[PDB]
Design a protein around this ligand. Structure first.
Ligand SMILES: CNc1cc(N2CCC[C@](O)(CNC(=O)c3ccc(CN4CCC(C)(C)CC4)cc3O)C2)ncn1
Lengths: 201, 238
């Protein structure tokens, strides 16, 4: 079911097996990098049940600070090989760039799992140039690149926010408005696993 | 305006459309005055005991010739066995050109092998205004990463220039500006430099160098008291 779907929840405690398999996964985790919002510990990140979401596909993993290293560890533990890295050059509305150096970019790791086939590798290039909006906000350009890469396929986003909801995407995040599910297979497995519609423990 | 879509449309990489790519000049003068004379040694680094390079360096710029730069090469197998820790000052810095593939991961293994932690990830973003394929690649690779490691106790992390001509393997000279504006000390080693990278304030050691002038004793003479702890951004001592 192509129109946006989403589940407000704690990605720590949701049983993500009911959601099926995905050709693309994106995550923008609240890495614990010191100093806001609720973060997750390195072990919580390590324990996230990413491995079930895919069999053959791609992982897109926003990293910053020490998460440049930690994300490479989570990405490897979860069973992916890092095969690319996208950087988003943050600009203003007139196309100028916004510890030891000032940061003009955000990094998103690209990982692969299994042998994914039919993907349009090489349509886009590993640099995004896009205007910065709210804090902690993804540039919409990344969804276009992921669409060209894998058109039509089912995609899931972890730690999204309301603006992030997109066609072909199931958005998980604890700041979304309730539950909105249209894929019948998912609706089914959700009614089975969560007969009273609450997600705990 | 979507510049990724524009790139799929026209071949102009999104970085082509970044525009604009005081006293931060007199600091360049201070660097200039405190710079040691250029020094340089031809050496086959595979076959060369790195310990004979003394004293211990405050900065190391490591630019191994990757096979990916061509489309003698060094694999990450070879890079990881260099005993960089044996020539690095207890407090010191490293800048490792990692390319754009596995080196982004293997260069991190290296930095940790030698005792550094990475505090900056400097990206060289190659525009293609003048000219609008790894199997594992998912996207077209249009950048290279220089990783910055520290051990012990003004600028952006971006260098935007036009992609060099095929077979030109030279890294942007701007990396030296970024390094030197940090004022990290005056013992600066550039490993796998070339004749064309030789620069004042730097010891260059490479296999393609065609002349040498290195003398360990003469090199150490530049940093004997009262000059041993200068940042390279201060005035000379009278
Ligand atoms: C408790 N467990 C949870 C949490 C959870 N969240 C969902 C919504 C948001 C949430 O509420 C708080 N986190 C952030 O706002 C947040 C901030 C910054 C960043 C870093 N990123 C910023 C965007 C970037 C520039 C593309 C790249 C860097 C990521 C974030 O995620 C955590 N959903 C389910 N379970």
């Amino acid at each position: 079911l192509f129109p946006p779907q989403w589940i407000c929840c704690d990605i720590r405690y949701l049983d993500v097996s009911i959601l099926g398999k995905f050709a693309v996964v994106m995550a923008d985790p609240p890495w614990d990098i010191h100093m806001p919002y609720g973060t997750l510990t390195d072990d919580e990140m390590r324990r996230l049940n990413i491995p079930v979401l895919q069999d053959d596909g791609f992982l897109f993993l926003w990293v910053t600070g020490r998460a440049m290293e930690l994300g490479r560890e989570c990405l490897n533990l979860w069973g992916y090989e890092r095969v690319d890295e996208i950087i988003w050059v943050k600009t203003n509305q007139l196309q100028r760039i916004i510890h030891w150096l000032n940061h003009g970019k955000e990094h998103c790791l690209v990982g692969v799992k299994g042998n994914p086939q039919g993907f349009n590798q090489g349509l886009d290039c590993d640099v995004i140039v896009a205007e910065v909006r709210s804090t902690s906000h993804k540039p919409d350009e990344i969804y276009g690149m992921i669409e060209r890469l894998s058109p039509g396929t089912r995609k899931i986003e972890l730690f999204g926010r309301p603006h992030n909801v997109q066609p072909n995407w199931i958005t998980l995040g604890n700041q979304l408005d309730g539950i909105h599910l249209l894929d019948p297979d998912v609706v089914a497995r959700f009614k089975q696993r969560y007969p009273d519609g609450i997600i705990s423990k | 305006n979507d510049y990724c879509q524009h790139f799929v449309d026209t071949g102009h990489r999104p970085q082509n459309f970044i525009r604009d790519v005081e006293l931060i000049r007199l600091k360049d003068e201070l660097i200039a005055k405190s710079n040691t004379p250029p020094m340089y040694l031809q050496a086959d680094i595979e076959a060369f005991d790195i310990r004979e390079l003394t004293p211990k360096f405050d900065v190391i710029l490591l630019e191994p010739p990757l096979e990916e730069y061509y489309r003698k090469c060094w694999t990450w197998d070879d890079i990881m066995k260099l005993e960089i820790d044996e020539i690095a000052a207890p407090r010191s810095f490293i800048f490792l050109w990692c390319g754009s593939g596995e080196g982004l991961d293997l260069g991190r293994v290296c930095l940790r092998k030698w005792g550094y932690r990475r505090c900056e990830d400097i990206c060289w973003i190659k525009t293609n205004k003048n000219n609008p394929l790894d199997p594992k690649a998912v996207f077209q690779r249009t950048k290279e990463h220089c990783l910055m490691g520290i051990k012990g106790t003004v600028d952006i992390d971006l260098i935007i220039t036009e992609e060099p001509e095929i077979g030109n393997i030279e890294k942007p000279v701007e990396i030296f500006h970024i390094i030197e504006h940090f004022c990290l000390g005056r013992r600066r080693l550039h490993l796998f430099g070339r004749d064309s990278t030789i620069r004042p304030g730097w010891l260059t050691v490479g296999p393609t160098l065609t002349n040498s002038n290195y003398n360990a004793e003469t090199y150490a003479s530049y940093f004997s008291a009262p000059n041993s702890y200068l940042t390279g951004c201060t005035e000379e001592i009278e």
